[PDB]
Symmetry: D2
Subunit: 162 residues, 4 copies
């Protein structure tokens, strides 16, 4: 099944989208704690009209339950690593962090339908769903223990940036 944006249109690669909580504003880079500034975690901004930092998806169609990479799109980057999402294996909390390799399997996630709402999804990694936990700046994306139910998943939509 093709992933759809908030307008019900199918997701394309090489196309800028805000990832916005379906459940404050969009998802942005921020540090998870005071122990490291780089690499960056993924936090929901508490500011209501901030749309989030845009991402592009790499594989023109994006389909559900398929290996994809998510890369922030930004003209400025304060860290010496990449803008591609990945899992902090060395973190005892398994934060989703930047600095992944867009071609490597370390950076692969899958987009799956969430609950009933249309155009609502979750991310799953290999199967563990992406949830959230309290961090310094607010809720940060973390890898949950499993993907048995949507209970612990952080529901998202994709909004096309024009």
């Amino acid at each position: 099944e093709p992933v759809k944006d908030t307008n019900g249109n199918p997701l394309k690669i090489e196309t800028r989208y805000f990832i916005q909580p379906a459940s404050g504003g969009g998802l942005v880079p921020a540090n998870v704690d005071l122990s490291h500034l780089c690499p960056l975690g993924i936090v929901r901004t508490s500011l209501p009209y901030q749309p989030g930092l845009p991402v592009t998806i790499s594989t023109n169609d994006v389909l559900t339950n398929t290996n994809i990479a998510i890369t922030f799109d930004a003209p400025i980057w304060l860290c010496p690593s990449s803008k591609t999402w990945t899992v902090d294996s060395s973190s005892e909390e398994k934060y989703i962090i930047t600095g992944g390799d867009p071609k490597s399997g370390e950076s692969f996630f899958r987009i799956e339908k969430y609950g009933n709402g249309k155009n609502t999804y979750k991310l799953v990694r290999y199967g563990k769903s992406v949830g959230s936990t309290k961090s310094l700046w607010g809720p940060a994306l973390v890898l949950n223990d499993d993907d048995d139910s949507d209970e612990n998943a952080f529901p998202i939509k994709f909004r096309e940036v024009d």
Copy 2:
């Protein structure tokens, strides 16, 4: 004559708008230099899809051109001890527009006037509001005159839904 938003609808008081450059993204609070963190200047973010921090307009519900208004940022968090209302830093050589003004005092009053080319395009006048290079990017400053649109920073108002 009523000020209009990007949809051509007239501006209302107590209504959130993005002030967006007509000439990066919207206008946001940021420090102008390394000498002070508070109060805050008004900077154009270089990030292309950042809409700006919303403002509300007050009158000392219609907003009309060439009339005294106050501009106040709207935000659930504020890192400085002073107000979210725009004003002129009289004590700076640059005459930065800064936060921390009194919305009821005349120090915080600006006027919205039509700007050159393009529908629903405006400038602020107190002397027109222009911009200069600052630490984080272009910061709003009060110019010398309002003789022409040359030095004015053109803006539009986009309704926040």
Copy 3:
């Protein structure tokens, strides 16, 4: 009403720079207490072992004596906040953080230096003693007299 002494056993002088160093990381420095405000500033113990702290000068409403009204003012060539460098109590707060921006001549900014424990050149600030709580950067000074919950300090003369 005996003189407060520095780590060299010399009596404290007014208008003289001292590091206030925890008597039990490095010295006391200005830092934000939480993510809700940058200004005004709280008083935090740096976790860095050889950072001496930001110097303060003491004023009196030349000896600094115990159990006497004094004001503490940070000494620095730059200040990123619009208010003063004088310590005071955040009168309306939960933890009653000690914060900058006080008036050194006003009673709002008065503290008293008293002996702490049965030790040597060790003190506390005070009815209510100055303690600490966990904050963003580390321990921050808060207003709590007994030396149970007091934050013990010493004074090191700066040269």
Copy 4:
């Protein structure tokens, strides 16, 4: 190859903490050079007069001698960047900032301590040899590869 001396005129030891302080603000510390990056870090003179600097240890690739390959490594219980505390040259900057994140065993991280001018116990760093100087950066003077930036070593404690 004569021994480098600290501010007390005592010879420098390897694996010993020193402040590197400008020979005539306070000591040298890690800080960002500009708004383009937080990591890795530059080497800046703090403008605060009583800040001694962040301590370093010197390693040899127990006396530290002049005109010999040495590595400089900051010593700290915390580090906010994902790389090492060892000094090196930012080859891919036009300023050639001295930056952290070097390999203490690689030749990229080797400097030499040479006597500077007249003052006793005063030195410069050299990496044909190029001396370490300074340029204006965001917070203040930052060390760059080229006068030289004269330094002294103060024993911690």
